[PDB]
Amino acid sequence: TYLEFIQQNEERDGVRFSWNVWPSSRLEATRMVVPVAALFTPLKERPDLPPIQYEPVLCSRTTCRAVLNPLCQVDYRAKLWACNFCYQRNQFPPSYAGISELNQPAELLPQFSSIEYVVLRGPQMPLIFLYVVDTCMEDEDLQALKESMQMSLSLLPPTALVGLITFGRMVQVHELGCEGISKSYVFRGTKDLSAKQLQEMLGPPPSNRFLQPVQKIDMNLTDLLGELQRDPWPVPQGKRPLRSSGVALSIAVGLLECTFPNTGARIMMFIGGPATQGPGMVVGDELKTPIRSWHDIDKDNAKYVKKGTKHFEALANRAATTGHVIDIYACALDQTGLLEMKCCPNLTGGYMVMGDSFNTSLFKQTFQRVFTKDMHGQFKMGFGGTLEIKTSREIKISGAIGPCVSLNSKGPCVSENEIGTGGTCQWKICGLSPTTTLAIYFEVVGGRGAIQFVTQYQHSSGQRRIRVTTIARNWADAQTQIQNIAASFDQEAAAILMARLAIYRAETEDVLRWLDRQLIRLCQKFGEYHKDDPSSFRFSETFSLYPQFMFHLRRSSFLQVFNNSPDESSYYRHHFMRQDLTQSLIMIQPILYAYSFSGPPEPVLLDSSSILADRILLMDTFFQILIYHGETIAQENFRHLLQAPVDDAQEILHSRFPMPRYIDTEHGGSQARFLLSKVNILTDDVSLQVFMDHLKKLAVSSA
C-alpha cells in the first residue's frame, strides 16, 4: 500500500517526498512537473530510539565520508563493508572487531535507518538565555510580561546563563548581583554599535558579569525583574513612546558575539510596539501618521520599510553566522514591525509569537510552550545545528526552504539550478525543535537511489549529538516510466512543497501565474482526458486532491496579502515555512467537523452547504480554533452538544505550539466572518466548482 508506505516512512525517517519513485532518464527528469523534493524533519520524535554512545563510523574517502547505514553491503567474514554512495570498501574499526552476523551494530538494521549518535568533542557549554525587554507599555502589560519572565526563569537549568537587557528610549545592559547597588550600562538608542565597539565599552564553567549562571543569580534577577518599571521618559500628547528596538537587538547580538560565539544561545526579545527611533525604525513618533499597510507599501507611502528591513537583515546574518537564536514576542494593539524584523527568527531557528497583550491567557500559555520538557526534564529545543546532505552521484541538491542559513560548502552534490537557500551541501540551523521541518529540493542529472541527512546539533542537556537518516527510493523501470512515477506521488507533500516555492518567490518578489501553469501541466501529464472535452477529465486517487489543495492555496492568506496587515502576513508565512506536513495542510485548507443531534462528530466539506442552522461546527485553522452555532442552536442532551466541540478543542488547543486563538460565535455575530471566508489571471476562481470547470477547460485544450 502506497499510503502505508508514506505513513511508515514519515514515522521512522521523518520525511515526506513528493515522489517516492524517481525518474531514471534525463528526458523525464527534465520534464518533471512537480520537482523531486522532501519535507524533512531532522529531529522528529518516535518510539524511544536507543541513543548510540559511540562514534558514527564514517567511510574512508576524503570526498564521500558517508555514515554507515542499512544500505551498505557488509561482509561479516572479511570485516569489510562497501559504501553505498561511493562504492569504497572499508575496514571495520578496532571497536567493531568482534562484529558477528547474529549480533550486528544498530546502524545497520533497517529499523535504525534514522538513528542518533552521542559524541564528545570536549566540555559541554551551558545554555544561554538573554532577555531583551521593552519597557514602553502599560503597567498591566509590563507586569504580566514580568510574571511570564519569572515563570520561564524557574524552568531553566541551574547551569544555564542568563542576562537582562531592558530598553525604551535608552538601552540598559544589566550587570547583576553587584550587591548594594545593582548596576547597568546605559547606551543611546539612536546609533548602532558593532561587536568590537560593544566589547570595548563593556570590557571551571565560564560566565561574564552580564551572563551569569541561574543557580547563583536566580534570586537577584527575580528581584530585579520584580522591580522593573516602565521607561521613565515621558510620552507627550499625540506621540508614540521612543522605542529603540533596532539598537536594543544589535546590542543583544553584539554582546553574545564577543562573549559566547558559536554556542547555543537564545536571544528572547519582548516588544510592546514598533521601533520608533534609531536604525530599523518602523514608524515615526507621530500618532497622526499610521503604521504602514500593504496598501501603503504598494503605493510607495512607507519610507521606513526598506531601510528598516536591511538593518534587521544584517543582524539576522550576524546572529546566524555566530550561531545564536533570536526570538520575537510581540504584543500590542497596533502593529509592531514584524515585517522588518522577520529575518531574525526566520534565518535563525527563532520563534515569533504574536498577540494583543502580554496580559492574556493567549500569550502566557504560548510562552511556556517554549520551555516544555520531555521524559527527562530537558527542553525540547536544540541549538547550532549543521545539516549536511549526501546524495547518490545521480542526484543533486537545488536548495532548501525553511529556517536555515547556507554554509556555502561546494561539492559535486550542488546543483547549478539553485532554489531558495541553495548552492551548498551544508546549512546551519541555529535553533530547532522536534517540529522544525525543512524542504529540500533535488534534481536528477536493480535500481534505488539514496540520500543521507546528517544533522549535528547541541542538545539542551549540553551533549553534542549527530542524527543520521538514510533513505532509499526506487529508480523508475524504463518499461514503466510514468506509470510507476504516477503511483508514487504524494499529493499532500507536493502541495506543501509547491506552496513552499510560491510563498518563497512572493516574499522575495506574478506568483499565482506560475502556480496555475504547474497545476495545468500536472493535469495534462498524469490526468486522463480526451482532447477538447472537459467532461472527460479524471484524476487518479493519487492526484485527485491536488487541485483542491491548489484551490485553497491561491486564495489563502499566504498569497493574497491584502485584507491582512504586513505583520500578519509575515507571521502566517513564518510558521508555514517551519511546520510539518499535517500542520501545513491544516493551514492551507482548514479541517471542519459537524456537531448535531443526528450523529456523532463527523468531518464535512469546506463548503457553505455544510453551515447548518441545527448544527454546531468546529473549524481548525492552524492559527485559530472556531466553534459556530447555527441560527437554531444559537439559543443533559442539549449540553452534550454545546460542549462537544469545546471538549474536542481543549485537547488540540494545548499540543500546538502557538496556541491558536479561541473563538465562540454564532449566526449573526461579528466573529462568524472567519468561517464564511475560509469556506466555499489564469484559473480565475469564484468557488471550487467553477475552479474545476475552468481547470478542465484548459487541461483538455492546447498544452
Binding site: 548594594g180 546605559v186 547606551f187 543611546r188 565599552m201 522591580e227
Partner: protein, 731 residues
C-alpha cells in the same frame, strides 16, 4: 605714627612686636569713622594720586583688594521697597554722598544730582547712609529667573590610584556628618557621579531597595541616562543618600581601572547641572589621560633648573566658561601623588568662580597630615555659607578706571563679574589707573555690589563703599601707602607675568618694583633711605621671592608652584601675608603680658620675632603661624619643664614623630600655650592644624624654609637683598 625717614641698613630690626594694622586714610574725623572695614575693602594707596603723571612717578601700583563675602559679626539688612540708586551710574546710595537740598543728593561717583524719593524719609539718618557695609533685598527686576535651589553635585574619581589613596572614605564620612548642615532649605538637591574609564551616574528612588549605578561608556558622546532621580531632593531622599555614602567607599576596593576620564566626566556633570546650576565638587587624584581634556606628562624640575607655567590645553578653560553661563561653579580637589598638570586643570575653577584645593601625595595611612588637613578643610567647605548665580560690579568715581581684574570669576563686560557661586573665603583684587586728572574733587569713592541668590531662595545684594582722599604731592602718596596691600597686588601681578612671560620676568618685575619706587623717593629727597610706610617693603617682596610661588633654586615641583599661585589669586590679603611672612613667637615661656581680659582666659601676647634662624634657640620652643598651619618647632636642648608639662614627654628623644596636635595636659604651662594657640585659630574660619613634628631632625623641617631673612645656596639673605637694592637706587 611718624613722618620720619628710615635707613634700612642701620635698623635691621624694623618689624614691630605687635600685629600690623591697615593704615588709616588721611580723612576727616566724621568721614573715616564711617569708612568701610579694611578687612572687606582696602586700597594700596589710601591717598589717591591726582594725576596719572603723579602715579607713574611713584612707581607704585594702584589697586584695591576686597573680601566682599566675608563672614560678618553684624550685617544691616535694608528691606526697602525701592533701592535708591543714582539715575546715571546706578551707584547705590552710600554714606559718602553729599546731601544738599535735603531732598536732593549728589552722587559721589558721577556727581549727578538725584532726587530723594518720598519714602526715604532726616534722610541722612537712613541706614543706607549710616553704614558702608549693607545688604539689600533685590526686587523682582534684579533676577533673570526664579531663585535657583541649592544644588550640590559631587564628582569622585575612583581609578586604581584613587582607591589606593583612600580619600573617598573621609569625604563620604564628612558628607555624612555634615549632611544636615549644608546650606539650603527643603529645595536642596544633591547628586553623585563616580568616574574612571566610564562615567557612573547614581539614581536614588525610595521605591527601590537600593541606589542604582548607571554607567555611560560612550566617552566621545556623553549624555544624561535618566531624567528624574539623578539630582534628588535631599530632604526627601535623606535615607537613600546616606546608604549610598556608606556604600561608596566599598564598591571599588578591587578595581583595575588605571586610567581616568576626567574631561568627559565634567561634560556629563555639566549637562546634569546645566538646567539649574549649583556647586560642582570634583575630586581628582591623578593626571587625566583618557578622552577629551587629556594632558601629557611633564618631567618635574629640580634645584638646578633655571626659570624656563601655562596650561597645555584650553579644554578646561572653555568648559569653565560653559559652566559660568549656566551658573555652575566647579571646585577642584586634587589629591595627586604625581604630576597632574594643575596648570591646565585649575582653569576649571579660575573662570567659574570656584576654588581649587590641593593635598599633595594624599594617603589614608602614610600621610596623616593631609588627612586631617582635608578633614578640617572639608568641614569649612561644606558648612560655610554660599551664594548662587551671582554677579559683582566694581564702581569708582569718574576719572579712575579699572583695567585689570584678579580672582576666580569670569569677566563679562568690563566692570561686570560673573560669580556662578560666591564663597565667604574668596579674595579679589583690581588694578586701576587715573584716566582723567582729579583736579575737581578732593575725595573719591569705590563701591562693590554683590547681587546673589541666598541658600534660602532670597535674591540679596551686599554692597561695600570705600572713600579715600586725593593728594597732589609725591610725599603725600608715599605717606598713605599700604605695604601689605602693595605686596598683595604685586603678588597677583607677578602671577600673570609668569603666565604671560616667564618666572624670570615675574621675579624681575617684583625686584624692580622696589628699586624704581625707592629710586623715585631718593630723587625726591648715603644709606638706603625709605619712608616709614615702606620700611617693610623689601622684606615682604623678599618673602614673596622665597614663597613657593616664585622661588627658584628650590626643589619645588610643578603642581606645588601652581597651587601656591592659585592661593595668591584667590585668598584674601590677610592670609597671603600670613603664608608669605609667617608670624613667629616663642612659646616655651609665655607669661601674663597678654590680653587677660576675655573673662577666665589669659591668652599671652608674646612679641613677634623676625624670620631669621638667628632668633631661634636650641634651648626653647617656637610656634610659627603660617596661616594655614601652626608648625611648633622644639629645640634640641629644650627645657625639661616644657617636655613633660607641655608635650607630655620625658625627653626630647621620645617626642612622637608625627605629633598631630598638642596634649591638653593639666599644667599651667599647657593651659597658657593652649590659651594662646586657641586664640590664634579663632581669628580665622579655616581651622589650622598644629603639628609639632618640626623637631630638629624630622625630615619635615620646612619650618626653616620660612626663615626668609637668612641666606641659602640659591637665594639672597635679607641683608644681601638690602645691599642689592641700595646699589640700584643710586646707580
Amino acid at each position: 605714627e611718624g613722618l620720619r625717614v628710615v635707613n634700612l641698613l642701620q635698623e635691621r630690626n624694623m618689624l614691630p612686636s605687635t600685629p600690623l594694622k591697615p593704615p588709616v586714610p588721611n580723612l576727616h574725623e566724621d568721614i573715616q569713622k564711617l569708612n568701610c572695614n579694611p578687612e572687606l575693602f582696602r586700597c594700596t594707596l589710601t591717598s589717591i594720586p591726582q594725576t596719572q603723571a603723579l602715579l607713574n612717578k611713584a612707581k607704585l601700583p594702584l589697586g584695591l583688594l576686597l573680601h566682599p563675602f566675608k563672614d560678618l559679626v553684624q550685617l544691616p539688612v535694608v528691606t526697602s521697597s525701592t533701592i535708591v540708586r543714582c539715575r546715571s551710574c546706578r551707584t547705590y546710595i552710600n554714606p559718602f554722598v553729599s546731601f544738599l537740598d535735603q531732598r536732593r543728593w549728589k552722587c559721589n561717583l558721577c556727581y549727578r544730582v538725584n532726587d530723594v524719593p518720598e519714602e526715604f524719609l532726616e534722610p541722612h539718618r537712613r541706614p543706607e547712609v549710616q553704614n558702608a557695609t549693607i545688604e539689600f533685598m533685590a526686587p523682582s527686576e534684579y533676577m533673570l529667573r526664579p531663585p535657583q535651589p541649592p544644588v550640590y553635585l559631587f564628582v569622585f574619581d575612583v581609578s586604581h590610584n584613587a582607591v589606593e589613596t583612600g580619600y573617598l572614605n573621609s569625604v563620604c564620612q564628612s558628607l555624612l556628618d555634615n549632611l544636615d548642615l549644608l546650606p539650603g532649605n527643603t529645595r536642596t538637591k544633591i547628586g553623585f557621579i563616580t568616574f574612571d574609564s566610564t562615567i557612573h551616574f547614581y539614581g536614588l528612588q525610595e521605591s527601590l531597595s537600593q541606589p542604582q549605578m548607571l554607567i555611560v561608556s560612550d566617552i566621545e558622546d556623553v549624555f544624561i541616562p535618566m531624567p528624574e532621580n539623578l539630582l534628588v531632593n535631599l530632604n526627601e531622599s535623606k535615607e537613600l543618600v546616606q546608604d549610598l555614602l556608606k556604600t561608596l567607599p566599598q564598591m571599588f576596593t578591587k578595581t583595575l581601572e588605571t586610567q581616568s576620564a576626567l574631561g568627559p566626566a565634567l561634560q556629563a556633570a555639566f549637562k546634569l547641572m546645566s538646567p539649574t546650576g549649583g556647586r560642582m565638587s570634583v575630586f581628582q587624584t591623578q593626571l587625566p589621560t583618557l578622552g577629551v581634556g587629556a594632558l601629557k606628562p611633564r618631567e618635574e624640575p629640580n634645584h638646578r633648573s633655571s626659570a624656563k607655567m601655562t596650561p597645555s590645553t584650553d579644554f578646561y578653560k572653555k568648559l569653565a566658561l560653559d559652566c559660568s553661563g549656566q551658573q555652575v561653579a566647579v571646585d577642584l580637589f586634587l589629591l595627586s601623588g604625581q604630576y597632574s598638570d594643575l596648570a591646565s586643570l585649575g582653569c576649571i575653577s579660575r573662570y567659574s568662580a570656584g576654588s581649587v584645593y590641593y593635598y599633595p601625595s594624599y594617603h589614608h595611612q602614610h600621610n596623616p597630615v593631609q588627612v586631617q588637613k582635608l578633614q578640617k578643610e572639608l568641614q569649612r567647605y561644606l558648612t560655610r555659607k554660599i551664594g548662587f548665580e551671582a554677579v559683582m560690579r566694581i564702581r569708582c568715581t569718574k576719572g579712575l578706571s579699572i583695567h585689570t581684574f584678579h580672582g576666580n570669576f569670569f569677566v563679562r563686560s568690563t566692570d561686570l563679574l560673573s560669580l556662578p557661586n560666591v564663597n565667604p573665603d574668596a579674595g579679589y583684587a583690581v588694578q586701576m589707573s587715573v584716566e582723567e586728572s582729579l583736579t575737581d574733587t578732593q575725595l573719591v569713592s569705590f563701591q562693590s555690589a554683590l547681587l546673589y541668590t541666598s541658600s534660602k531662595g532670597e535674591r540679596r545684594i551686599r554692597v561695600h563703599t570705600l572713600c579715600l582722599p586725593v593728594v597732589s604731592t609725591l610725599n603725600d602718596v608715599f605717606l598713605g601707602a599700604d605695604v601689605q596691600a602693595i605686596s598683595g597686588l604685586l603678588a597677583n601681578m607677578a602671577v600673570d607675568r609668569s603666565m604671560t612671560a616667564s618666572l624670570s620676568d615675574a621675579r624681575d618685575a617684583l625686584v624692580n618694583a622696589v628699586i624704581d619706587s625707592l629710586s623715585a623717593y631718593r630723587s625726591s629727597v648715603p644709606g638706603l633711605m625709605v619712608p616709614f610706610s615702606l620700611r617693610l617693603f623689601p622684606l615682604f617682596v623678599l618673602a614673596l621671592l622665597k614663597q613657593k610661588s616664585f622661588q627658584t633654586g628650590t626643589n619645588a615641583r610643578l603642581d606645588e608652584r601652581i597651587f601656591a599661585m592659585c592661593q595668591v589669586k584667590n585668598q584674601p590679603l590677610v592670609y597671603l601675608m600670613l603664608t608669605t611672612h609667617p608670624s613667629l613667637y616663642r612659646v616655651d615661656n609665655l607669661s601674663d603680658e597678654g590680653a587677660l581680659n576675655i573673662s577666665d582666659r589669659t591668652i599671652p601676647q608674646p612679641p613677634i620675632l623676625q624670620l631669621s634662624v638667628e632668633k631661634l634657640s636650641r634651648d626653647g620652643a617656637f610656634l610659627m603661624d603660617a596661616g594655614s598651619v601652626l608648625m611648633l618647632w622644639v629645640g634640641k636642648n629644650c627645657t625639661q619643664n616644657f617636655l613633660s608639662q607641655v608635650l607630655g614627654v620625658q625627653n626630647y628623644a621620645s617626642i612622637p614623630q608625627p605629633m598631630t596636635d598638642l596634649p591638653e595636659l593639666d599644667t599651667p604651662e599647657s593651659a597658657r600655650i593652649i590659651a594662646f594657640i586657641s586664640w590664634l585659630r579663632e581669628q580665622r574660619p579655616f581651622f589650622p592644624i598644629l603639628y609639632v613634628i618640626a623637631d630638629e631632625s624630622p625630615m619635615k623641617a620646612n619650618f626653616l624654609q620660612n626663615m626668609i631673612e637668612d641666606r641659602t645656596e640659591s637665594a639672597l639673605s635679607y641683608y644681601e637683598f638690602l645691599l642689592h637694592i641700595q646699589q640700584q637706587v643710586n646707580k
